[PDB]
Amino acid sequence: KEKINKIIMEATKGSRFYGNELKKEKQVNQRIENMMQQKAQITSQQLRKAQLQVDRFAMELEQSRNLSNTIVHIDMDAFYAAVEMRDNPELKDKPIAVGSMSMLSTSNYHARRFGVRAAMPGFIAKRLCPQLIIVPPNFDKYRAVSKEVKEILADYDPNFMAMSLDEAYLNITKHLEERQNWPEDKRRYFIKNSVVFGTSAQEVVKEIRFRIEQKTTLTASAGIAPNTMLAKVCSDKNKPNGQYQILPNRQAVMDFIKDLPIRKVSGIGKVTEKMLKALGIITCTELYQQRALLSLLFSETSWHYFLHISLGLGSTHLTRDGERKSMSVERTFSEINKAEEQYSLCQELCSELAQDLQKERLKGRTVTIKLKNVNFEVKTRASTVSSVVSTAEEIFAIAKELLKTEIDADFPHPLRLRLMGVRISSFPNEE
DNA sequence: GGGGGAAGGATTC
DNA sequence: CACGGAATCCTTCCCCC
Ligand SMILES: Nc1ncnc2c1ncn2[C@H]1C[C@H](O)[C@@H](COP(=O)(O)OP(=O)(O)OP(=O)(O)O)O1
Ligand SMILES: [Ca+2]
Ligand SMILES: [Ca+2]
């Protein structure tokens, strides 16, 4: 059934949307032509110099390899899909998918065999699965089912820190310590009879995958590695409802990534993947022995990242206690080109922004407005201030101008918008 | 020269 | 019958000291 693309492509070609992609895709394909050339003109000598620099560095990274923490990553299974299939049985053995007709968020495994995967227009999906059932999301439910899963994690790490509703990291390195010598009374749980769990990190995670099960009906995969970088990759190795671990010794970390696809990493995306295969980089093992050249093509802050993924290095301290940098609200709709109407919705927006921006009492000193053209061309203007602006009023006050500035710049021709947005940032976060 | 800040990308759930 | 919303981090420039 791999000829899905013959329906996917077949129903995107002309699309206002597709057209825009080409440029996004060309522009990038060129950022590459540039990188390839700028490279080809590097002194076969500079590498000797570079190499030394790099190697030297690594040698040290390697010396401070922190293999003492046992990080765990829990990742729910088709979370939004699952939750709904649970609450409304009539679905159960049918092909569903949370989201709308425009964009789909998750999909149960059965609906996936048709091609329905996250981030795929709703209408498109129904072409691969006419018998589909699209359920509109109710974040108020999920947000809540999550907190029941969290309360369970807590009994394992007070500062668990959660990346999202379906993901979360844990440092069971401490709970592990105080468990080795524990009776069997604190390690048995009732079914619905009992089952008792061991002391290995393998079992501790098995107990968590269990406590959750029997308190939601939902299942989730998990990974266990010395650092958070591998944990995220490891949880998916044996999904759904499963897990995988990488022991603490060096070799494990190495033998693991040895032939691991660079993209798989929780940071390498569509661009970095293409952009890197350009130099022939596919696995971390390859990447590692191109450390010289890399060091002279990607800004410093970057090859640092790559060098890490080469050695199998990740973080080992789940910061915790959300700092928060920005905060926003946006929305797409039907072409709104009418002059007046613009400020109009903008009013409503800023309102919501401040509105939501109140529960937590914060105040930033720079507003950002986002205007998305009818042909998916974005543009974002923002202006800084002296204040700490907070009330719905204060905000619009600025946003209206920035918005105006554009209507003029492109004045006697209307601004055919498809989406608009207002993001507030620059919080003092206490000085 | 260096230290933000604005613009627009890349990434993930 | 027409490709989300929200956060955060990164890549380049241009501007004021
Ligand atoms: N663009 C998106 N918007 C909202 N949610 C998304 C988006 N992309 C993915 N997700 C969510 C929906 C699912 O919970 C999940 C699917 O992506 P995936 O990379 O497989 O994560 P996952 O491993 O946690 O989910 P799964 O158990 O389905 O495999 O992430
Ligand atoms: Ca999930
Ligand atoms: Ca995952």
Short mmCIF file of C-alpha atoms (C1' of nucleotides) in Angstrom, two decimals, chain A residues 28 166-167 232 268-269 380-381 384, chain B residues 5-13:
data_model
loop_
_atom_site.label_atom_id
_atom_site.label_comp_id
_atom_site.label_asym_id
_atom_site.label_seq_id
_atom_site.Cartn_x
_atom_site.Cartn_y
_atom_site.Cartn_z
CA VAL A 28 17.18 25.36 1.72
CA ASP A 166 2.49 12.28 26.54
CA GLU A 167 6.16 12.59 27.53
CA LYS A 232 14.26 9.80 24.26
CA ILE A 268 17.88 16.42 14.09
CA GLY A 269 15.05 17.35 11.74
CA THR A 380 6.87 38.80 12.08
CA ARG A 381 7.32 42.30 13.50
CA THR A 384 10.67 46.48 22.44
"C1'" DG B 5 17.44 42.99 18.85
"C1'" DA B 6 14.83 42.25 14.89
"C1'" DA B 7 13.62 38.50 11.02
"C1'" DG B 8 12.78 34.27 9.73
"C1'" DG B 9 14.21 29.25 10.29
"C1'" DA B 10 14.18 24.47 12.30
"C1'" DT B 11 12.09 21.23 15.69
"C1'" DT B 12 9.12 18.71 18.56
"C1'" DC B 13 4.70 17.08 20.60
#
